Ligand binder design. Structure first.
Ligand SMILES: Nc1nc2c(ncn2[C@@H]2O[C@H](COP(=O)(O)OP(=O)(O)NP(=O)(O)O)[C@@H](O)[C@H]2O)c(=O)[nH]1
Ligand SMILES: [Ca+2]
Ligand SMILES: [Cl-]
Ligand SMILES: [Cl-]
Ligand SMILES: [Mg+2]
Lengths: 58, 166
């Protein structure tokens, strides 16, 4: 599925290439989408489960 | 099932990680992204046989030479990568090869020569030089671009085909 963030924005989970949890938020980078790579962040509260599953143990 | 123990080697910055991450995750490793040494598994179908790729993405500068040798001892086949705009990395190729043969103690080690960054306009290692080198080793040569994903599947699969030929 997709990740909603920020100017709302949706990026498909397969495009997330890097992600960590810090300071109550989840921080991620993603591949070319609409022809441009980029970053985002979502509060740990509103984070999709398959996003959170990409995090390191534990 | 049958697992293939693949080892990606080559000079620093030739695109070992970019090739491996494209194959495994369909992302492009740019200059800001992790390129650190790690292993990756992927199940694939090659010529109608399902198999598992167990891929070691090695460091350009390996910390322990005896560790690197033990990597090569375990490895069943090797992607020797250079960048087509880096003559040193190309000259570094024979180096990796001899190291692999000496450690393996064998003449028929499965091996594919990979010329990466073929998307770039400024080439300094033409196809003929690589094909010639590859010819003298008796191994295939594959041109890749981890950026555009050109030849990524080809490089690794051709390496598997090489192992299937002993
Ligand atoms: N234009 C272009 N740049 C590429 C290509 N492959 C890799 N690069 C760039 O080359 C640089 C190094 O790539 P990388 O995959 O990190 O190389 P590496 O061999 O793993 N280096 P290391 O030994 O330090 O781990 C990065 O800036 C990357 O984006 C390619 O096919 N085309
Ligand atoms: Ca095996
Ligand atoms: Cl990025
Ligand atoms: Cl095997
Ligand atoms: Mg690397």
């Amino acid at each position: 599925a997709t990740v909603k963030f920020t100017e709302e924005k949706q990026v498909d989970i397969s495009k997330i290439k890097w992600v960590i949890r810090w300071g109550q938020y989840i921080w991620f980078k993603y591949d070319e989408d609409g022809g441009a790579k980029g970053w985002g962040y979502v509060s740990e509260k509103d984070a999709p489960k398959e996003l959170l599953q990409m995090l390191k143990k534990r | 099932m049958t697992e293939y123990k693949l080892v990606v080697v080559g000079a620093d910055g030739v695109g070992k990680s970019a090739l491996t991450i494209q194959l495994i995750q369909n992302h492009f490793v740019d200059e800001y992204d992790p390129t650190i040494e790690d292993s990756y598994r992927k199940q694939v179908v090659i010529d109608g046989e399902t198999c598992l790729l167990d891929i070691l993405d090695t460091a350009g500068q390996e910390e322990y030479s005896a560790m690197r040798d033990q990597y090569m001892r375990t490895g069943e086949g090797f992607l020797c990568v250079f960048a087509i705009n880096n003559t040193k990395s190309f000259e570094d190729i024979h180096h990796y090869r001899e190291q692999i043969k000496r450690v393996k103690d064998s003449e028929d080690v499965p091996m594919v020569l990979v010329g990466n960054k073929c998307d770039l306009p400024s080439r300094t290692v033409d196809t003929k030089q690589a094909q010639d080198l590859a010819r003298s080793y008796g191994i295939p040569f594959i041109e890749t671009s981890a950026k555009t994903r050109q030849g990524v599947d080809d490089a690794f699969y051709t390496l598997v085909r090489e192992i299937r030929k002993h």
